């Protein structure tokens, strides 16, 4: 499976993407009065699915 000749591996990209937004979410977990704002990218990401 780890080797299988199949596109399933795209799951990787899916992961990567969630990691991106997740990172953003954490920096937004930081106190900051611009508390929504750049989370817009979290929006863009999520909505990309």
């Amino acid at each position: 499976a780890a080797s299988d000749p199949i596109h399933y591996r795209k799951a990787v990209f899916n992961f990567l993407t969630k990691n991106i937004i997740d990172q953003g979410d954490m920096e937004y977990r930081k106190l900051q009065p611009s508390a929504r704002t750049l989370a817009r990218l979290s929006y863009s990401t999520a909505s990309s699915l």
Binding site: P33, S34, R36, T37, L38
Partner: protein, 98 residues
């Protein structure tokens, strides 16, 4: 403005929200969004340094008001290696007229 369903019967000030929204606008330009005059960085930094917050900005205003009360330039913006030379003189040995 950051106009949200959040309510919780929380009391809120027009002044404050207006301010916050202005900050929104500012930031929407500070970060490259819809083309804004993202002013030179020193100005932008002053924004985050003082206008980011009332008390920050307020203190800034206070200073810019003060003719002098306590500016007391034990140190200062001004500098030349003169200044470190001066310091060296200050810190060497024990103080004397020479």
């Amino acid at each position: 403005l950051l106009d949200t369903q959040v309510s919780a019967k929380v009391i809120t000030s027009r002044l404050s929200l207006v301010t916050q929204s202005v900050q929104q606008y500012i930031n929407r330009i500070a970060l490259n969004l819809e083309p804004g005059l993202s002013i030179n960085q020193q100005e932008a930094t002053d924004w985050e340094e003082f206008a980011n917050r009332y008390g920050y900005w307020a203190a800034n205003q206070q200073l810019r008001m003060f003719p002098e009360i306590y500016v007391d330039p034990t140190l200062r913006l001004t500098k030349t290696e003169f200044f470190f030379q001066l310091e060296s003189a200050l810190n060497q040995g024990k103080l004397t007229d020479d």
